[PDB]
Scaffold this active site. Structure first.
Site: not given
Ligand SMILES: CCCCCCCCCCCC(=O)SCCNC(=O)CCNC(=O)[C@H](O)C(C)(C)COP(=O)(O)O
Ligand SMILES: CCCCCCCCCCCCCCCCCC(=O)OC[C@H](COP(=O)([O-])OCC(O)COP(=O)([O-])OC[C@@H](COC(=O)CCCCCCCCCCCCCCCCC)OC(=O)CCCCCCCCCCCCCCCCC)OC(=O)CCCCCCCCCCCCCCCCC
Ligand SMILES: CCCCCCCCCCCCCCCCCC(=O)OC[C@H](COP(=O)([O-])OCC(O)COP(=O)([O-])OC[C@@H](COC(=O)CCCCCCCCCCCCCCCCC)OC(=O)CCCCCCCCCCCCCCCCC)OC(=O)CCCCCCCCCCCCCCCCC
Ligand SMILES: CCCCCCCCCCCCCCCCC[C@@H](O)O[C@H](CO[C@H](O)CCCCCCCCCCCCCCC)COP(=O)(O)OCC[N+](C)(C)C
Ligand SMILES: CCCCCCCC/C=C\CCCCCCCC(=O)O[C@H](COC(=O)CCCCCCC/C=C/CCCCCCCC)COP(=O)(O)OCCN
Lengths: 88, 104, 220, 67, 62, 80, 178, 124, 175, 459, 128
Positions: A43
């Protein structure tokens, strides 16, 4: 005295070394033209991890816009070679 | 100009401008050799409070310690010849007040 | 101070050169065995810097502390000087702990090499200086100062005690970093790390106001 | 002198630098020990601090509270 | 050529300055002033030969 | 120049605290796929390092021996 | 630096950028390697906890909360690679970079030195001259009549063609010109 | 330290002021006080060019030390006895100053006590 | 050296102590000074003696210029331009001479401070006294003329000061 | 004094009777020879001036100005023969004729014994400069610049003519020696206040005084290189020379009539130094530097002290030389890029290293680096102002800070950073430009060894 | 949750903390597309002259000319005497002059009064 004149084969060997030190990729199927998405079943987060591993390997940063495009080890080797002005 | 994307391939890399794009009125004040407006990890009006408080507290405590100095439990130093009257300037034609020190 | 501070900079520059222009201690690992001469020189320099007894810094800094303790002095200045004396050992410990102890944190291509006669001899001269110059000079200049011959024992050893406390506290807080625990920084850490926000304010507010009045009012 | 990079291995050290580093560290510690053995008063003090309470009133001339 | 550097960079400059100081700077008054040499009780002056007397019968708190 | 890369199969997280980290993660249902990449920093001459007080006392043995022999010589020679 | 940027960043690109940035700052906070491995695996778990949601509004709100988390918990002094825009050796070698057109101003005595290099430079200049009009023609053919929409440039499609606008990209001075 | 703690927190009128000192006559409580002696004359200290703050009652030992340093110049480790003598004289001066401070303190707290005690007698 | 009058630039008799070594170690400065004397001082002396031999073959003299004393501004009528010119030139020369006298006294003061050493505050009271009186006189002479100064303005200043002194004595004798 | 005037006049028939390819060589060689001859005027007396005749004299203040004026013409000829290559022979000879007439007028101005002849030549200097600016200027704003430059000066100096004529009627003569010997005070009257004003503003306009300087950023920018050099180096010093000459008649009215001018100058140095911090034009920055530096000379003249007069003379000489060098340096870049914007051509140290060295030296001299004669003049004026009032040190120190700030800003913007990618017509520095820079800079450093030659008669 | 960061003039709002990039409309996408089209057209126009072998001169930039002309020559034609304009001009032009005049006049008056009573300790003051 300083760093040796980095060559193409050294870059390729180090990139493959770092790639085959990765548990989600086996050494027996990893090739130079083996894409990360369609061939090895990974991914996007694993691709970011691979780019970061290459950055810590060679000690220089790769911009995010440039990093997304890379998908096979040959692309990484070519990008590093053109970035560091390596022709042999 | 420090906030502009450093990874973009600008026509002018050091200035971080493109050729035909409009130029800010105050470009020479934001040339990134100068005034910077980039975001900071700590917010303004909080940096100011902490810095002003530190400086004011240091000044106040220096004044307080001036009011309440630290010294040693000793008497003033004693110098033999009329408190070195001749060596501290001279004026040998007035016969100053003789100060006398005793063993204790 | 000239001797050992110049030597400290030469050791830091040797480290920077041997790690391919890397200046961050967070990417410096185990150099105690990799660069033995640099480690020896920097250990001696830190000991001189921290007023270790009989080092070149002992003949000046400890006498300075003693004079400040035996004078009609501002009390806040005295306390601040003592705290700075402790913080000297604090920061010195950090350079050694993050630069010379632990496991490597630099890129895998090891280019470390300190086997150059120029570097070795240049560092060694000021090493001998940082070892013996205080004793050589302090016993050879005529006395232009009345000494502090009579002191209480607890105040005679103030500087050594505060340096030892600095060493221990800094070492404990540094060893705390190995634990598998994460926590967000406090406001005191942010104040200390951002230099008290002094460059974040005085390099932006007065410069902006001056440069804007120079054009809006004076020019236009 | 010509040494080579090693790529994830401990760097190759010479005999000279180890000897020099050990010699200089030992020299520093020997100097410290020798000076402390010969100049202990420079660290521990030489003249004992007198106790003001131990002094009598005869020494400092204090009247017997009434004349 | 073995010791040529020490001649054209050390000996030659000090020849000129010594000549410049001995015959052109001291030709005028107060150009080179030296701090008076310290005189301690017990020394003999090379100019007059007089002897500075000893320093008054120590209390000898030994 | 003309130097070879080490064999990649010699990098194991065994004995190293990377194994401890892997066990702490396995106690949660996760795996760390980059341990062998970081394993080279714990294997060779980097396997063991000195402590802070052991670093400060780098040359104490030789210096102490020299001090002892010198003070003994000066003590047993001044008996003239 | 080598790719023509798009008009906007997609949700996936923003999430990947945030993931890389958070990992870098966590590595800055976690100096030692094994602790960074532990907390980076935890970070990967935290990102994968919400990868499969099909609702874009809640995903965007999660992204906003994650950006606020990062900006509150970021390292004030993050690690920067030496040759990076914030590194200690960022533009150290820009004063040693001399453009190639300065070689045309040399004295004939200076060009008496290095004759073979200047012969190669002359044939390079001839090659550059012989290809300009074809590049211009290809550029004015393959673009829409209402001006280009992207900064991306086309390659050479025929056999005797060189990619349009190549001279200043191919003849970069160096990273280490001296 | 305890003297500062007692002065700043306790009664400030029971302990001496280091700047306003001494506040009692030097022969107030003493039958006979021998005036302090100075061995080195003014001209000797002038010709030695010691310093203005080094021309204290310990100046003769300082002259000894300077002369001893001057004659035995290359051997910069031979002037130890004179150094010790000068430091001992300085220590004697410092303990004398401590004695003056303690006498000032206790006469100052005795005067207050006796004055208010014979005031307690005059309450009626 | 006899190149200057030693009463205009006085100098103490230069008492120096005898070298009385009390150790057995050799004195490094003695050997260094012998090397200096035989290695750099002697060739310089030889060169200077050659230069003096060359000078002795050609001896010529330059004479200090002496000026007559002309009537000053007080003996000149209001619009007599020639007497005014001569008096003004004489006043300018006197002004320069006074400046040089102040320079002489300042040189003595500087030399005295360095020469005496650490006891300078009491050692050279006389130089300080000499400089105070000379500075007071020079100030009362030339303090506030400013640019475009002339003998007429100095005369007016002197007249005003004399009037002030006369009035001060007038009310001083009335008490 | 005719041994200098007659050769300068003979420069004209030699120029007009020269062949079309030999005009520059003859002009430069004979101008340099005239400068060498004029060097003999530095042998000044200690008491009175050199009264050559009833018409001309020379003092310790006129001699350095005369030497600078004679030395400047060869440099203007050197700097002019680049952009005048395509001119016709007649136009080149006319330009050289204008420059020679300017030199002759300035030479006869600095040695005129009376104030009316001084005024006549001091205003005769206007027509050659005006012709140069309005004929050989490059842009369309040269006409407005010429109008401003002409009318400011004439409006400021016609009352000076009226006042001088009145003074001659009331006193009988305007010979400077007679005036100095027969000086008499002014009563504190309104008529005397206005006669003070008439005798002063004529020179305040040309210093220029702050608020009366609007003409300078126009004239110095629109003029060709030689015009700008002569405007900055010599023509600004006419006001200072005239003021130091004419305050003899003025006292004591100056003790309180100088308050508005002192306030204006000590605040205007700050204002102009701040203006220099945000300037998109290099030549305009160099022009504002001149006002910022001449405000200090105004202060020194107005406070009427010998130290201030000496510092003012030294500062005038140093400013002339430094401003001429800076204008030449800017013209070298303008002749390459054909624009005056500062951020257009940047990073020029990589391309032209010796010009980078010249830029560094000129910038160091501008910010009064010890032991420059700029420092000598500025420090003498600062000490005189401190004696005048201790609170002046705040403004003097702030001005010294801002001067270094904008000087190093100008150095870094033009010579540092990365070179513009598209300016590919930057040819290597010519021998003529390097020789111009060297002939500008060597006298500055050499004058540090004998600073009494440029300290005026008060020394 | 955590303490909130608030932007200022010299510490502006980061893009990741700006709400406008998390509430996007097709209008915003159209605007971004047109902005990118403008930038791409300008970049192509610049690079066509930049890569031309034949040209040997500085490439003119109308934006720089507009900037300099607006900052220097275009100011007075667009100047109107308004209450804010007049007040700011009068203050910044006249207030400092009278402030410094008052300060210096009081200082010199005090010094002159001290001179006329002979109280400055003016000994050794010769060079003035
Ligand atoms: C100093 C320390 C800093 C810490 C703070 C930050 C912590 C953040 C933790 C939580 C993050 C979220 O909620 S971020 C929300 C994540 N989910 C979405 O955005 C919905 C759809 N998912 C996707 O598109 C894929 O999972 C994708 C991510 C694009 C990858 O996929 P490829 O690669 O296959 O493309
Ligand atoms: C002899 C007899 C007398 C005995 C005297 C005392 C005896 C011993 C007492 C010991 C007491 C404790 C000593 C250690 C102190 C704490 C150590 C520490 O670092 O803890 C970390 C802890 C939290 O750290 P973190 O953020 O989690 O760190 C993140 C990572 O770990 C980041 O990790 P990293 O890798 O970046 O490393 C961080 C680094 C840096 O660590 C930090 O981030 C904190 C550093 C700052 C504190 C250091 C102490 C300095 C104190 C100076 C005070 C001066 C007055 C200031 C007044 C300001 C007024 C506004 O760590 C270190 O430097 C090592 C610790 C310090 C080493 C030196 C300690 C010894 C010297 C001090 C004691 C001296 C003893 C002898 C004295 C002899 C004479 C008396 O913070 C503290 O504990 C210190 C807080 C104390 C100061 C608070 C000040 C108040 C702030 C808010 C006030 C309210 C404001 C309201 C608004 C007002 C607006 C106007
Ligand atoms: C104290 C030093 C003692 C020196 C002994 C005598 C030296 C005589 C020098 C006469 C003046 C220099 C001639 C000016 C034009 C330069 C020629 C040239 O084209 O260079 C290319 C030439 C060929 O090399 P290249 O490969 O073609 O390089 C091409 C690039 O240009 C790359 O070139 P670059 O990157 O190597 O830079 C060239 C150089 C050249 O650029 C310069 O800036 C040099 C000009 C000096 C600074 C200018 C502003 C300061 C104004 C103060 C005025 C003082 C007047 C003193 C009398 C002057 C007599 C003419 O710039 C610098 O390196 C930095 C200069 C700043 C030095 C510090 C000055 C401030 C404090 C000095 C105190 C002055 C009083 C000393 C006595 C105090 C009491 C004992 O390189 C040289 O010849 C360099 C010359 C050495 C640099 C001089 C720096 C010290 C001089 C200070 C004043 C001299 C005092 C003499 C009295 C005795 C003491
Ligand atoms: C943009 C800048 C360009 C340069 C500007 C130069 C400024 C020139 C102004 C020079 C200042 C002096 C002029 C007049 C002298 C004093 C002015 C007045 O304030 O003094 C008081 C005078 O009192 C009253 O103010 C009378 C003056 C009132 C009329 C003048 C109004 C001017 C205000 C605005 C001036 C604008 C100047 C610029 C014109 C374009 C003193 O009171 P008093 O001791 O009893 O009288 C002394 C005069 N005596 C001795 C002859 C008797
Ligand atoms: C670029 C702008 C510069 C403009 C400068 C203009 C102002 C110049 C200063 C005043 C100029 C006129 C003064 C007259 C010339 C001197 C004549 C003189 O000194 O004689 C006086 C003459 O005095 C006058 O007549 C004064 C007339 C003033 C009328 C015109 C006023 C013009 C405006 C004055 C202010 C301008 C000065 C500063 C302005 C700066 C620019 C803003 C004595 O008169 P008596 O006949 O002897 O009578 C006394 C014995 N019975």
């Amino acid at each position: 005295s300083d760093a040796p004149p980095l060559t193409l084969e050294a870059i390729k060997d180090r990139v493959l070394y770092v790639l085959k030190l990765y548990d989600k990729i086996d050494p027996e199927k990893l090739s130079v033209n083996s894409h990360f998405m369609k061939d090895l079943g990974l991914d996007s987060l694993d691709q970011v991890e691979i780019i970061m591993a290459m950055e810590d390997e060679f000690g220089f940063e790769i911009p995010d816009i440039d990093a997304e495009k890379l998908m096979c080890p040959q692309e990484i080797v070519d990008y590093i070679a053109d970035k560091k002005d390596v022709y042999e | 100009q420090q906030e502009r994307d450093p990874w973009y391939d600008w026509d002018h890399p050091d200035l971080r401008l493109n050729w035909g794009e409009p130029i800010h009125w105050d470009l020479d004040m934001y040339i990134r050799n100068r005034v910077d407006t980039s975001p900071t990890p700590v917010s303004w009006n909080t940096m100011c409070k902490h810095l002003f408080g530190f400086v004011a507290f240091m000044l106040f405590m220096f004044w307080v310690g001036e009011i309440y100095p630290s010294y040693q439990p000793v008497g003033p130093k004693q110098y033999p010849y009329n408190d070195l009257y001749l060596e501290r300037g001279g004026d040998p034609t007035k016969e100053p007040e003789p100060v006398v020190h005793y063993e204790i | 101070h000239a001797f050992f501070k110049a030597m400290l900079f030469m050791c830091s520059g040797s480290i920077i050169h041997s790690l391919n222009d890397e200046q961050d201690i967070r990417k410096m690992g185990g150099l105690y065995k990799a660069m033995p001469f640099t480690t020896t020189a920097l250990i001696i320099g830190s000991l001189a810097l921290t007023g270790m007894p009989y080092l070149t810094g002992f003949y000046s800094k400890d006498l300075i502390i003693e004079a400040v303790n035996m004078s009609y002095t501002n009390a806040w200045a005295l306390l601040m000087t003592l705290i700075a004396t402790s913080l000297t050992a604090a920061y010195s410990t950090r350079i050694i702990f993050f630069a010379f102890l632990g496991k490597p944190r630099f890129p895998p291509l090891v280019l470390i090499n300190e086997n150059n006669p120029l570097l070795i001899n240049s560092i060694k001269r000021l090493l001998i200086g940082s070892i013996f110059a205080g004793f050589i000079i302090s016993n050879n200049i005529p006395p232009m100062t009345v000494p502090n011959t009579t002191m209480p024992l607890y105040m005679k050893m103030t500087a050594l005690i505060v340096t030892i406390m600095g060493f221990m506290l800094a070492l404990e807080l540094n060893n705390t970093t190995y634990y598998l625990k994460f926590k967000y920084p406090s406001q005191t850490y942010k104040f200390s790390n951002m230099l008290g926000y002094y460059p974040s304010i005085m390099h932006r507010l007065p410069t902006y106001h001056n440069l804007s009045m120079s054009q809006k009012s004076a020019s236009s | 002198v010509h040494i080579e990079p090693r790529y994830r291995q401990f760097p190759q050290l010479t005999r000279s630098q180890l000897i020099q580093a050990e010699f200089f560290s030992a020299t520093m510690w020997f100097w410290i020990l020798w000076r402390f053995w010969h100049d202990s008063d420079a660290v521990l003090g030489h003249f004992p601090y007198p106790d003001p309470s131990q002094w009598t009133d005869e020494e400092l001339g204090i009247l017997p509270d009434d004349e | 050529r073995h010791s040529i550097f020490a001649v054209t960079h050390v000996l030659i400059p000090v020849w000129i300055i010594h000549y410049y100081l001995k015959y052109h700077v001291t030709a005028k008054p107060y150009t080179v002033v030296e701090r008076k040499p310290r005189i301690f009780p017990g020394d003999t002056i090379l100019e007059t030969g007089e002897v500075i007397p000893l320093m008054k019968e120590f209390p000898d708190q030994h | 120049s003309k130097m070879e890369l080490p064999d990649y199969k010699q990098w194991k997280i065994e004995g190293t605290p990377l194994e401890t980290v892997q066990e702490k993660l396995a106690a949660r249902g996760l795996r760390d796929p980059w341990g062998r990449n970081e394993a080279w920093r714990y294997s060779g001459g980097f396997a063991n390092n000195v402590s802070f007080v052991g670093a400060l006392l780098k040359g104490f043995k030789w210096g102490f021996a020299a001090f002892v022999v010198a003070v003994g010589a000066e003590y047993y020679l001044e008996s003239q | 630096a080598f790719s023509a940027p798009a008009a906007y960043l997609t949700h996936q690109q923003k999430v990947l950028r945030l993931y890389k940035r958070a990992l870098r700052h966590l590595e800055s906070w976690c100096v030692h390697r094994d602790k960074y491995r532990y907390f980076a695996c935890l970070m990967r778990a935290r990102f994968d906890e919400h990868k499969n949601e099909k609702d874009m509004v809640k995903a965007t709100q999660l992204l906003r909360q994650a950006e606020e988390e990062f900006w509150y918990g970021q390292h004030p002094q993050p690690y920067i690679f030496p040759e990076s825009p914030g590194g200690t050796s960022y533009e150290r070698y820009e004063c040693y970079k001399v453009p190639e057109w300065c070689l045309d101003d040399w004295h004939p005595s200076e060009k008496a030195m290095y004759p073979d290099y200047f012969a190669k430079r002359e044939q390079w200049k001839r090659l550059r001259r012989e290809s300009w009009e074809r590049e211009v023609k290809q550029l004015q053919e393959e673009t829409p009549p209402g001006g280009p929409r992207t900064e991306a440039l086309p390659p050479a499609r025929k056999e005797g063609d060189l990619p349009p606008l190549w001279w200043h990209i191919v003849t970069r001075p160096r990273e280490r010109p001296m | 330290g305890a003297h500062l703690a007692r002065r700043y927190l306790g009664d400030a009128s029971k302990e001496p002021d280091p700047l306003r000192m001494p506040t009692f006559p030097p022969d107030y409580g003493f039958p006979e006080r021998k005036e302090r002696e100075m061995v080195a004359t003014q001209q000797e200290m002038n010709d030695a060019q010691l310093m203005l703050q080094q021309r204290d009652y310990c100046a003769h030992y300082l002259i000894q030390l300077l002369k001893c340093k001057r004659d035995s110049f290359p051997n910069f480790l031979a002037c130890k006895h004179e150094q010790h003598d000068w430091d001992y004289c300085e220590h004697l001066d410092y303990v004398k100053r401590m004695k003056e401070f303690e006498r000032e303190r206790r006469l100052l707290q005795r005067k207050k006590r006796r004055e208010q005690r014979e005031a307690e007698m005059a309450r009626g | 050296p006899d190149s200057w009058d030693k009463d205009v630039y006085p100098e103490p008799p230069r008492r120096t102590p005898a070298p009385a070594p009390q150790t057995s170690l050799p004195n490094p400065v003695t050997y260094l000074t012998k090397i200096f004397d035989l290695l750099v001082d002697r060739p310089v002396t030889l060169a200077r003696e050659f230069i003096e031999q060359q000078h002795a073959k050609n001896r010529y003299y330059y004479y200090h210029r002496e000026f007559r004393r002309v009537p000053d501004i007080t003996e000149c009528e209001e619009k007599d331009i020639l007497c005014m010119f001569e008096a003004e030139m004489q006043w300018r020369r006197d002004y320069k001479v006074d400046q040089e006298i102040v320079n002489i006294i300042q040189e003595r003061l500087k030399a005295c401070q360095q020469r005496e050493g650490e006891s300078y505050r009491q050692n050279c009271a006389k130089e300080l006294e000499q400089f105070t009186q000379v500075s007071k006189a020079f100030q009362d002479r030339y303090s506030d003329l400013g640019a475009h100064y002339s003998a007429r303005k100095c005369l007016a200043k002197q007249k005003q000061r004399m009037l002030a002194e006369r009035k001060a004595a007038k009310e001083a004798a009335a008490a | 004094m005719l041994k200098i005037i007659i050769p300068t006049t003979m420069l004209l028939p030699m120029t007009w009777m020269s062949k079309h390819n030999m005009i520059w060589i003859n002009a430069t060689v004979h101008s340099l020879l005239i400068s060498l001859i004029s060097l003999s005027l530095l042998n000044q007396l200690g008491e009175n001036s050199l009264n050559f005749s009833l018409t001309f004299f020379s003092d310790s203040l006129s001699a350095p100005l005369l030497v600078l004026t004679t030395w400047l013409l060869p440099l203007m000829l050197m700097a002019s023969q680049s952009h005048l290559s395509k001119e016709t022979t007649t136009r080149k000879k006319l330009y050289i004729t204008m420059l020679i007439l300017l030199q002759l007028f300035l030479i006869m101005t600095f040695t005129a014994t009376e104030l009316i002849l001084f005024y006549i030549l001091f205003e005769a200097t206007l027509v050659p400069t005006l012709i140069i600016i309005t004929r050989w200027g490059n842009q369309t704003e040269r006409l407005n610049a010429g109008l401003y430059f002409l009318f400011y000066t004439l409006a400021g100096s016609l009352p000076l003519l009226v006042a001088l004529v009145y003074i001659q009627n009331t006193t009988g003569s305007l010979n400077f020696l007679i005036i100095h010997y027969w000086s008499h005070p002014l009563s504190n009257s309104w008529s005397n206040i206005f006669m003070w004003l008439a005798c002063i503003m004529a020179f305040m306009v040309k210093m220029p005084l702050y608020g009366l300087h609007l003409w300078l950023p126009k004239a110095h920018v629109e003029a060709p290189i030689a015009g700008s050099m002569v405007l900055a180096a010599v023509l600004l010093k006419l006001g200072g020379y005239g003021m130091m000459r004419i305050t003899t008649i003025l006292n004591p009215l100056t003790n309180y009539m100088a308050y508005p001018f002192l306030m204006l100058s000590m605040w205007g140095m700050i204002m102009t130094s701040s203006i220099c911090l945000r300037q998109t034009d290099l030549k305009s920055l160099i022009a504002y530097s001149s006002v910022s530096h001449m405000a200090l000379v105004i202060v020194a003249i107005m406070i009427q002290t010998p130290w201030s007069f000496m510092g003012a003379t030294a500062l005038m000489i140093a400013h002339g030389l430094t401003s001429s060098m800076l204008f030449c340096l800017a013209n070298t870049n303008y002749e390459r890029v054909h624009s005056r914007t500062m951020i257009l051509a940047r990073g020029l140290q990589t391309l032209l290293p010796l010009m980078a060295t010249w830029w560094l030296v000129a910038s160091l001299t501008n910010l009064a680096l010890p032991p420059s004669i700029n420092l000598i003049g500025e420090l003498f004026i600062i000490t005189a102002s401190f004696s005048w009032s201790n609170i002046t040190i705040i403004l003097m120190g702030m001005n010294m800070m801002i001067t270094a700030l904008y000087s190093l800003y100008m150095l870094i913007t033009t010579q540092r950073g990365k070179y513009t990618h598209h300016i590919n017509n930057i040819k290597p520095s010519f021998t003529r430009e390097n020789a111009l820079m060297a002939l500008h800079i060597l006298p500055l450093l050499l004058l540090t060894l004998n600073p009494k030659m440029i300290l005026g008669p008060l020394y | 949750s955590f303490p909130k960061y608030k932007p200022s003039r010299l510490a502006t709002l980061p893009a990741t903390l700006d709400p406008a990039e998390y509430d996007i409309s097709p209008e915003t996408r159209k605007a971004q597309a047109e902005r990118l089209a403008i930038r791409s057209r300008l970049k192509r126009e610049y690079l066509l002259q930049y890569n031309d072998p034949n040209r040997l001169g500085v490439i003119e930039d109308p934006a720089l000319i507009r900037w300099t002309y607006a900052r220097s020559a275009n100011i007075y034609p667009n100047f109107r005497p308004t209450p804010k304009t007049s007040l700011l001009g009068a203050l910044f032009g006249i207030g400092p002059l009278f402030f410094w005049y008052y300060v210096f006049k009081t200082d010199r008056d005090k010094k002159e009064k001290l001179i006329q009573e002979g109280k400055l300790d003016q000994t050794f003051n010769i060079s003035y």
